[PDB]
Design a protein around this ligand. Structure first.
Ligand SMILES: */C=C/S(=O)(=O)c1ccccc1
Length: 282
């Protein structure tokens, strides 16, 4: 069977070998390295692919699965906020999807700054956070939305649509119904903002490294990967892209953990089967 346990076991096998191969070795050439001793990676073993790094001081990667282009990153460290906001601004971010829970953010032991729900000043950058709408995704999962306006002297003021699922616990997978609802909402939000820039004749439209949806959570390899996978599967241009392709591409473009838990992979499998999308590559 195409979606039978034998097929699932084979997929899991192939991806496991890939994760182990991609594991970062000390001073790994494939991964972005910290500078002068200042922490770059929130987690020592969840690193950032150098070839696709967005900024030299952020754990963040440009990711292209099939035709879907995005940016995946870890929750910025307090010391990276300024550079983080810079990335968001320069990217003309059409949507910022944060899947880190409100509990994680609230726990000061985690060092996850409340940067998109609060207004403040960071270096020479000043940010305002306007709470907008709230959208249920099912099973009680809630999406809180905000408008993040980024201001800096001499720079074009940029406002960013934020989609925050604050009750999706770490290392777990919300149902495929919830995932599809979320991916639809994120893409929809992104399409509205991107359209705005295109109507204004923004030069960012001609730059493939810009206008990308930015997705992340705490480490940016689980809930983040699950959403990205769902998003690429919603792209009407990714016909024939298999789950194997999908997960391997995210892994080679960020790190080998992308799609952290089996439960998260299962959701991607389920969505694939729903569309008749192949799991393995022949
Ligand atoms: C998108 C966050 S996550 O990848 O799910 C994660 C965060 C912290 C620890 C493990 C996974």
């Amino acid at each position: 069977s195409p979606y039978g346990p034998e097929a699932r076991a084979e997929l899991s096998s192939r991806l496991t070998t890939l994760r182990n191969t991609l594991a970062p070795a000390t001073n790994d050439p494939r991964y972005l390295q910290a500078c002068g001793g200042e922490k770059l990676n929130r987690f020592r073993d969840i690193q950032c692919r150098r070839q696709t790094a967005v900024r030299a001081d952020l754990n963040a990667n440009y990711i292209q699965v099939g035709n879907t282009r995005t940016i995946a990153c870890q929750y910025p460290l307090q010391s990276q906020l300024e550079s983080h906001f810079r990335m968001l601004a320069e990217n003309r971010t059409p949507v910022l999807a944060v899947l880190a829970s409100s509990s994680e953010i609230a726990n000061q032991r985690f060092g996850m700054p409340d940067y998109f729900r609060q207004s403040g000043t960071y270096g020479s950058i000043t940010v305002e956070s306007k709470m907008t709408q709230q959208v249920g995704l099912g099973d009680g999962i809630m999406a809180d939305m905000y408008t993040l306006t980024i201001r800096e002297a001499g720079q074009k003021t940029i406002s960013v649509p934020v989609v925050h699922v604050g009750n999706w616990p770490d290392q777990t997978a919300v149902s495929s119904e919830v995932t599809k609802a979320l991916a639809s909402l994120v893409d929809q939000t992104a399409e509205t903002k991107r359209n705005m820039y295109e109507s204004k004749g923004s030069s960012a439209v001609a730059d493939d490294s810009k206008l990308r949806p930015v997705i992340h959570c705490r480490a940016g390899v689980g809930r983040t990967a699950q959403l990205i996978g769902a998003m690429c599967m919603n792209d009407s241009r990714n016909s024939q892209l298999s789950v194997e392709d999908m997960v391997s591409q995210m892994r080679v473009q960020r790190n080998g953990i992308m799609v952290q838990k089996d439960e998260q992979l299962d959701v991607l499998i389920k969505l694939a089967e729903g569309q008749g999308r192949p799991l393995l590559n022949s």
